Design a protein around this ligand. Structure first.
Ligand SMILES: NC(=O)c1ccc[n+]([C@@H]2O[C@H](COP(=O)([O-])OP(=O)(O)OC[C@H]3O[C@@H](n4cnc5c(N)ncnc54)[C@H](OP(=O)(O)O)[C@@H]3O)[C@@H](O)[C@H]2O)c1
Ligand SMILES: [Zn+2]
Ligand SMILES: [Zn+2]
Ligand SMILES: [Zn+2]
Ligand SMILES: [Zn+2]
Lengths: 354, 355, 353, 353
């Protein structure tokens, strides 16, 4: 039979459609959602034709669910189990896994199937490929609002911290304090950073950035970002800069503010432009040892399990990211439009299913 | 005027106060007078176990915050009157080992360790710091003295255990031994993003500080073998890393038994007895379990101290909880030293505050 | 249904009969074109270094021809000439997501052939996950050099990988049997400048020089530690790779590596309860002498990269083969060469083709 | 008391007479036994690369004989024949402790010769921190090879070091000037399997093959991205080392490496506002294509490690030396060659011994 889902129809057009219910392969699971959350990624897919032009493709890639059914080879999950579903759900049997980059298993960024090559999570059911490798059990002591921050927001933000090569006591700059940037701040704290400098203006974000460990807040007003951060560091710069937002020009701010031998760690999706500019002089004319990394978030069962431990054992509380809680399935359209309209008091919305 | 009073080891087994010539600096050195000092168990091994051999009239101690008295003509960043954290390690910084990336072993194995070894320690009215510009860090006024004197050694050693452990975001970590060094390995594990931290120790004062610094489980090596309790705690999985910060040589076999394949054993504890540290063949995968074993003298130098000052300054770790005894008075050095020798059940770390 | 050479009991070997393997939907059945015996099967048979087994066909080093594939195999077809990895792991585990496929499902569990499944010393053998655990063999590589890729090349190279060799570093290789010889060439592939090889057999000493060793230390001629200290002018070595010896070679390796260097073991220790780490020369725990010890990487990607190193003439493993025999019967003879360890042996190869 | 070849102004060069340099207690005075010119000096002069200078002696690649030492110099005495490192940094700084001596005291401040100091193109020159920035030169290495060590060898090898080359990985080297040629050898030294060298000067193409290049790619036969993509059957390269080209070579490098691979720059980019990163081929910021660009390591240890690589015949840099001149006056001739290299020249050496 069929089922209901909130999809993208054409560029700039969304709505509800009705498709045949998904069925699992023997290694797969069919999940029904318990809490979902929309993303800026869904917006660039609709109002910018980012991943190309789809047609009746259900949106959303951050979900916590209850396993509805599992194929015959699924060993560690059974119907009724409550699970965190990672946003990345890669095919784990490729040479790219053997090379150590599961995010690109099968091609560049091919590990991200939800709302891309597959129907997303904004439905009554969705399909998880390789349940034993892409699902993790949700402890009862973690509320659905916090868990639904793990699949994408926590892992991307913590990945920026990881890529930053943060040594103990190093000063970190986080450029952008949306939900991803906020998690990059907590991840920097989770890496032994001393001083953490957050760049942003939204006061709900600025309050949350301090709560996640920021010691300084640089505003887009009050001066230019480069000069402000160099003044705070007394002309020394930062050891690492985690890019978590902006357009291509932020790449030059980060290269200008990190010291020689430091790291620029980007987790931002650059949606437009042919090139991202690296400033030649502040990159030491090519010889300043300022490493630039840019990475898609890790995913999979073990990645979620480790983030679940950080939430369980009280190392990070991702709930303060949730500024809007809706109840009920039909509120997915509301939360989606909230991510497009983006009021000043919004960080991340969550739809809890009845 | 030309002399100086200090607490010294007279010979193996005997300590006492002596008088000695004041040290003068070289062009790059500084003379520093103690503002606060702390004794270490390393000094107990040296006096009473001869761990480093015979010394006559050597002033002990190697953890000090102090005020600069005199600087050589080439010292650029430190003038008399400056309050400085003194790196416990004071390497010669122009050696091939520094270029190899191991300042701790500049000029020889453990040769960056000079205080109360090849040079008079900090338990005197004055002491010599070689290469002030590289081995001193400026002390913020916002940091109390008793908390700052934890940085030269206790903080940088415990943190080295966590750095060597290769901790990943959310990994499970076991800290073996929770004296002052193990307690700072617990905090360092938390700094590197450990999820579950399993602390191993018996004394209540250390167990309380272990939970303060981030331990989520306590294993008492009296309720049964450590390895059985930890294996049951992790339901057969083991731990991603085991930081060794105390115990006899047998603790190395315990660490190997509790870390999973691919995990790390990071030792920072000093072993003073026994010919061999046992690595069990079976639980080391007969040589192929990928259980890396590290063991390293603590990092020192100015950059090391500054980064740790920053961690205290920005409220990332409060080492003040390590200080169970604070004595005011230069001569309480001796009494604080004997605390380290006797080890009462409520002692973690003592601090002597000078005038 | 089929025959093969097997460990019957601890210390006891011989031929047995088995039901012919059938492949699961992701597996392949392979018949051997060429196999080789290992010292590791010796340690397992005549020492029970991992415990007892019953009716287990032996062997883990084989180049072969696929005879049957499963329903979901995509890149491998019946008739394909393949390099089979000694380690044939289940690639869908938590340990693979942690970066340790060698221990997928448990310590050393990536190692299935002649450990927990019937090996390659048989008319046929089972390969789990063909797409992930097989590599296509180019025509340009002969069988005798190709059957050194599954195990000797990957283990010896892994020792060089664990050693953290810097450009121009001085590296010591302890043991120059087949694994140590590939560790000498691995260190050469990692930019080692000076390479000191330790060993006794003249056939090994000669191949050690061929692969890159600049110096030879005969452990029977005198203490390794004194000889190496003389060669390096008391400075020691930057890294020491262990590819042979008894348990005490661990102390030798710690004593010859300088502070901050690495000890990289790839040797299978089969005897004794403990491996001794000498307390004094390990800096009493603080010398930064890192000790590693790992089972060789396996799988399709690992084999494809080693194939490239042979194809582009970066290493020639064919000099490891000192004995070649033909036919199933001679597997027995080649296995005893590994046990009897005669003085002109490095590695034997049995051609079935 | 000294004659040197110097930058008179922007655009003008010539022999001048300055006062003899005098050693600090830790520095040494050295006279050149053999020198080589660089293309950076061409930028420094004929392009105003580093502002203006007056009477600043040029050059920064020299093998020399120690003439004078300060009272604190322990390991070098007058008359010692030494390799002098191009990067002569202040080893007592914050950046040394952070692990970046190339930037000790500032961004690229480890560079002093023909920058903030009189270069090696003089009867004498000053080396700061002699014990830390000189290495003894064994008699076994000819002067022409040894002078290839201070810059060409250490820069080109650093590109391979930065590349994170795994054993058997496929590496591309963009540009086959002397730095690219050493980058090809460095990749061989890191265990690269297939090495795709990009360039077209016939002296450099023959030189690239000699150092391990398995493929050569000429811009004349098509675009670089398409040829390399076609050579790897669309798979790409595991690492690309940039050793030449305009700013847009950065875009060619991102396009040819697979996701998860590394672009490693060691090329001097002297023109343009930005170095371009092609957004789409960088995975819109998430393709895990790490970009590295680093100045060459310096110091006594780096030089000793590369001396061993030449001493033990791991690389022979002699092939970089296409032209050998004799006599001081010929310095200007050799320097002028770098302004516009003949299509048969890689690197020139002036012998003064
Ligand atoms: N399980 C796996 O998949 C796997 C994979 C690869 C290798 N391995 C293990 O790798 C190890 C090496 O294998 P192999 O075939 O190269 O071994 P091998 O043929 O026995 O060679 C051993 C080497 O060690 C030397 N040696 C022996 N005793 C010594 C001593 N006391 N001091 C110094 N050198 C000494 C030998 O010298 P002589 O010349 O005098 O004999 C020889 O050079 C084995 O333990 C093997 O099981 C395991
Ligand atoms: Zn998203
Ligand atoms: Zn101490
Ligand atoms: Zn084997
Ligand atoms: Zn140059």
């Amino acid at each position: 039979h069929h089922m209901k889902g909130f999809a993208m129809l054409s560029i700039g057009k969304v709505g509800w459609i009705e498709k045949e219910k998904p069925a699992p392969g023997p290694f797969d699971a069919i999940v029904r959602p318990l809490a979902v959350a929309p993303c800026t990624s869904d917006i660039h897919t609709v109002f910018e034709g980012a991943i190309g032009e789809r047609h009746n493709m259900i949106l959303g890639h951050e979900a916590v669910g209850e396993v509805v059914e599992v194929g015959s080879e699924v060993k560690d999950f059974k119907p009724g189990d409550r699970v965190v579903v990672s946003a990345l759900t890669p095919d784990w049997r490729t040479s790219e896994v053997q090379r150590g980059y599961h995010q690109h298993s099968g091609g560049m960024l091919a590990g991200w199937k939800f709302s891309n090559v597959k129907d997303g999570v904004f439905g009554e059911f969705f399909h998880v490929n390789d349940a034993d490798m892409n699902l993790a059990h949700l402890p009862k002591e973690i509320p659905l609002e916090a868990a639904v921050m793990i699949p994408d927001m926590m892992t991307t933000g913590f990945h920026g911290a990881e890529l930053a090569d943060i040594e103990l006591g190093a000063t970190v700059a986080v450029l952008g304090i949306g939900p991803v940037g906020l998690m990059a701040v907590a991840g920097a704290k989770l890496r032994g950073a001393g001083r953490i400098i957050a760049v942003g203006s939204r006061p709900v974000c600025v309050d949350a950035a301090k709560y996640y460990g920021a010691t300084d807040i640089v505003n887009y007003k009050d001066g230019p970002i480069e000069s402000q951060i160099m003044n705070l560091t007394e002309g020394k710069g930062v050891d690492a800069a985690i890019i978590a937002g902006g357009n291509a020009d932020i790449m030059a701010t980060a290269v200008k503010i990190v010291k020689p031998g430091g790291t620029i760690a980007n987790v931002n999706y650059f949606g437009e432009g042919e090139v991202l500019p690296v400033p030649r002089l502040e990159w030491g004319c090519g010889m300043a040892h300022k490493t630039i990394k840019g990475g898609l978030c890790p995913g999979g069962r073990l990645r979620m399990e480790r983030l679940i431990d950080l939430v369980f054992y009280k190392r990070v509380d991702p709930s303060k990211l949730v500024t809007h809680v809706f109840r009920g399935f039909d509120n997915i359209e509301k939360a989606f439009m909230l991510m497009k309209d983006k009021p000043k008091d919004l960080i991340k919305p969550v739809v809890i299913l009845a």
